[PDB]
Design a protein around this ligand. Structure first.
Ligand SMILES: [Zn+2]
Lengths: 232, 86
RNA sequence: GGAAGGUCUGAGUCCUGAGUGUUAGAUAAGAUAUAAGUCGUAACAUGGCUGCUGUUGGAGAACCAGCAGCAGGAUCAGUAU
RNA sequence: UUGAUAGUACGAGAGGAACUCUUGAUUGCGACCUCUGGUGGAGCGGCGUGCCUGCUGGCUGCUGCGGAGCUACGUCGGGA
RNA sequence: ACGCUGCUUUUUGAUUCUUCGAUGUCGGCUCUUCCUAUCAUCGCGAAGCAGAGAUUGCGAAGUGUUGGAUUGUUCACCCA
RNA sequence: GUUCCCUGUGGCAGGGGUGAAUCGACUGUGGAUACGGAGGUGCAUUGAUAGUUGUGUGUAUUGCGGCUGGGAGGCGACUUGGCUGUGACGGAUGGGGGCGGCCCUGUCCAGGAUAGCAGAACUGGAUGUCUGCUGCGGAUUGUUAUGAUGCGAAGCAGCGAUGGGCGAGCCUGUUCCGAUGAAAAAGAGGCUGCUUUGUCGUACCUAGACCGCAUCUGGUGUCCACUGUUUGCCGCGGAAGUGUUUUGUGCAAGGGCCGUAAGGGAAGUCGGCAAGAUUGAUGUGUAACUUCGGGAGAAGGAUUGGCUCUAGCGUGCUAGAACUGUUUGUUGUGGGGAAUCUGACUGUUUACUAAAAACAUAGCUUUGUGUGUGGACGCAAAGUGAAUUCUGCCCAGUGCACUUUUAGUUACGGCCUGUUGGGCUAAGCGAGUGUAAACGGCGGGAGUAACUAUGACUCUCUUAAGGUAGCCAAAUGCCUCGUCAUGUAAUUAGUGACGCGCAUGAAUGGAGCAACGAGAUUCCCACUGUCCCUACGGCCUGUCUUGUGAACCUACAGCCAAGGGAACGGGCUUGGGCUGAUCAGCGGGGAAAGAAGACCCUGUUGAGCUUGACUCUAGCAUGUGUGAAGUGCUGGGUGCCCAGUGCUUUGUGGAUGGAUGUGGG
RNA sequence: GUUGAUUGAAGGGAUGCGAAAGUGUUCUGGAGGAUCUAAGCCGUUCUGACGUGCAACUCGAUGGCAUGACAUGUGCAUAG
């Protein structure tokens, strides 16, 4: 055989990468006052980015829905509750939506940083200083009560409300983001390139669930380690 | 004008009728004009996804992809605003 | 009108387009009167799971099940420290 | 193949021929251009586009008729 | 009828003698020539041949044997 | 890479020619002769060079001097020797205004042709304002279009900026994107005088000066280029500039590219292949169906020149009338209609025999993953292929997942016990449960309704479950040219209907055709040399002359009948024969030429690809040896060895030896 | 780098109907992987020419596409 498409698309990307800018906020224990100086678009992202200026430091963060240029926000551990306002996660009531939550007290942000997402604060277990939160995927996770966050949802709304509708729109999206476009189906190739192969009719020819444990790398194509298949 | 098709009349008869109704709904709120809150004039338009700007006084704010506010943004903007009063 | 011709009225021929009737057709869904029947028993008694109206799924067939409503019901009604 | 032979011979009837004479054709073969048809970058006319300053006269494009010659859809020709 | 004896080389088999340092492999269209086991035209017998229409046999290969619908078809099957 | 100029000569030989502050590069950026960037324009000059030589005027720069100022004005916008700005950024489209060129027009000075006539022609040259901002003012105002305005309209006064008609840069708006349109070098500045400006390239050729073996009908980045007709920078014709010869014939048959045809009108053919036919503009008139947008330029009918006038306002377009000809006017520009199969649509493909029903696509569904610079509206792997309407039943086999906290099976090393055995300590396999938009699968036999016929109903064998909704002799039906109807004079074709369907059937996707198609099929109108059946004509070839002058192929050769022969002889045996040596034709034979048959078989000859072939292997999983010191804690058996295990700082995280399992990558 | 035309979506103006809710007509504007044509680019058919060729893939007529999921010079990255 020859080497399959999955493995070559991985090698092309170490030669010529897609790069995003790494948003994060700094450490400031005393309550300061910031200044949104600009909100801007970025290639390969869907969310707009805000430029906020402190007394001796500037930062780039995901803008929340409800920000505007020239607005003042506060940073510090004991800061008041309002859209924006980087503050510590024990000063936040239950049922409130936050974004860009860190996990180690000083790493910037880790959770909920894409277009239109947030995490939920569910419980404050005041003994042991633990906070249960819900992250965007649904998993529940206890963090310390000293990690910081941002109040509100990320801007950029529901981007899937509008269909792509046309070939050229999927062409411009994959140029900016790096998806495989177009995709030739594996059953339409010759056997030399794909485990799905030739044959006098187009058909896979054997089970499409494959293992995730113990088999050769380059055999893991299809539905890898699937617990269940079917419509519902 | 057109009876049922509106701003989706640029598509002729392509793509199917269910998909042309999704285009018509999101295209009306995306290309409309909104009143500014700082100056009070009707001059807000969309620049890119999530960026709405006023042509007079130049102020920029952040919202939804195709609408100026989103249904889950309104819900949490109130909670922060009731929490401060009470 | 000197004539070649011009003008008005206009049948008929040749072609296209609506209408309003009437009719043939392989196949094929109903209705009704019969015979002589075959399979069951849905309704009428609390008719052996009370019955009926709308709606949505299912079964050889009557019909069966879910959600709300009606008595044309099997109740004009029953002891508060 | 037409007319005559003949509604005759033959036959209860119904039906129904031949030798000899006579009229036209179909197809093959070999010629011919008087007539009719086709063609005719020979010739004459009509209507145009550009160019010679315009009219006259030219050159260039499309069109009607179209002699001679060639031809067929036209004309001629079979042992006792 | 039941049995028995032949001929042709147009069918399809049987065989493997020639050709694998290559003999262009189906049908149609076009064009020529040969055979007779004669379909028509010419001559002549038989009859369960009255006439008419056909049926069966002998001499005879000079001349003729068409136009279409459906199928790639050979073949087949209908119309004139 | 000297091909450029001059001289001599029958192509060579000899001697000449390329001049730079103000052209390009040597300098910027992870890149560069097209991106960024200190600096110019006229006129004249050689045999051959010129933004380079000479000259009129300007701009920058190297260095060296001399003199001189740190404030005046304006309510304000701003004026002045009086710093900290730029470089620096996409597509489409409207309005205003135009470099050069071209056209119409008044006047003046000249040019070329002419038999005759021409209100005096034709040609050349020269001349012929508001995007914005401030003060007062105090409510209206404007566009082709969207508008502007008590967050201060119009108006008045200022500041700043800058002959007529057909538009390039330029000014000013609107719009489009899950696409929003590089980076770095390079800032300072007044009036004057002298002085400086390094290195390398520069001749000639856009195809007869390049590549394709060549003076080859092929290929090769960018810029400029007039006019009549016209919507048209196309087609059909003209300028400017550029290229070009002067003693071959005159035209048989057969070819290559074209023109015209009586009467018939697809009878031709596998098949309307080829040709003919429609064609611009403006009134009129437009169906079924349909995703309501379309279908649609549907279909069908009519008008059109020249001349002389009228009407409108926006002055070149639009509308109306009379007259006239040998009846005729677009001297260009889509054939249409009725059905079936198939792919939704615009797109892409086998450079050199396949353009498609193949591939892509939006939409729809499933799977994995809490972190990569990227943080689940994310990133990656598969199938189906727009919308609409649907997507049934089967977990027994194979695959995948979880669990083994209630069987078995199983390796190094360590520990235990014993005379060289036995115990204890893994994952995997096995077992249990779940999963079909995973791979796939989806039955026989007997009776039974008052004529026959059939079987709602019953018994029976049997499966993991027995093919559901729909659809069909369909690109899927062997038998088969199935059976009935319809179109023809005549139907192995087409369409409609029927269904025990060799072997239809549900994201292996089923049913379904609005819109789109150089896709596959059948019929109708129109039209014709496709044919009946061919004729005549044009130009280039061929035929004939002069010059230049190949190749393939060749045992030896070259008339027939029969015979025998390795079973189809030019030559052998027995018979029959044209014609003494030319020229043009032609396709019967030479089992004609080309190519050590690709089909087929054999060889103990290969290679591409697959897997349930044999033997192995990268990677991955899981125990275990090596590695760093000190301490506490809970549990096992007999004092014991081990498990997890927290803590302390003072090793470190980079690795490395062997064992078992898995492994068409 | 990319000519000249055709069709006429949203938004905006005017005018008519109606008790109201609502709706008719017509201008303006200039959307869309919307329809032709040019510079040009491809390669459907003639199974046309040619087939020791102009040519180791060309020539003629006919046809398809021409604002893009385009075409093209040059710096860099990918190698059996
Ligand atoms: Zn504003």
């Amino acid at each position: 055989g020859k080497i399959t498409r999955r493995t070559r698309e991985a090698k092309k990307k170490q030669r010529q990468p897609i790069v995003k800018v790494c948003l994060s906020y700094p450490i400031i224990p005393q309550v300061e006052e910031g200044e949104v100086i600009d909100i801007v678009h970025e290639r390969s992202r869907g969310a707009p980015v805000a430029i906020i200026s402190f007394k001796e430091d500037d930062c780039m963060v995901p803008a929340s829905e409800g920000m505007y240029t020239g607005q003042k926000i506060l940073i510090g551990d004991d800061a008041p509750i309002d859209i924006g306002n980087i503050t510590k996660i024990k000063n936040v009531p239950e049922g409130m939506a936050v974004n860009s939550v860190e996990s180690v007290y000083g790493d910037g942000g880790t959770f909920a940083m894409v277009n239109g997402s947030y995490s939920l604060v569910v419980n404050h277990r005041k003994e042991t200083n633990e906070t249960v939160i819900k992250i965007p995927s649904g998993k529940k996770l206890t963090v310390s009560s000293e990690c910081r966050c941002i109040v509100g949802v990320v801007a950029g709304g529901g981007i899937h409300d509008k269909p792509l509708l046309k070939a050229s729109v999927a062409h411009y999206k994959a140029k900016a983001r790096g998806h495989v476009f177009p995709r030739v189906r594996g059953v339409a190739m010759n056997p030399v390139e794909h485990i799905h192969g030739g044959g006098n009719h187009q058909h896979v020819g054997k089970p499409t669930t494959v293992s995730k444990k113990d088999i050769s790398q380059e055999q893991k194509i299809g539905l890898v380690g699937a617990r269940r298949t079917g419509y519902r | 004008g057109t009876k049922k098709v509106g701003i989706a009349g640029s598509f002729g008869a392509r793509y199917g009728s269910t998909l042309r109704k999704r285009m018509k709904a999101v295209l009306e709120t995306q290309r409309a004009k909104y009143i500014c809150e700082a100056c009070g004039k009707k001059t807000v338009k969309r620049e890119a996804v999530g960026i709405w700007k006023c042509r007079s006084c130049r102020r920029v704010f952040a919202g939804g992809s195709y609408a100026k506010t989103t249904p889950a943004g309104k819900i949490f903007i109130n909670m922060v605003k009731q929490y401060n009063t009470k």
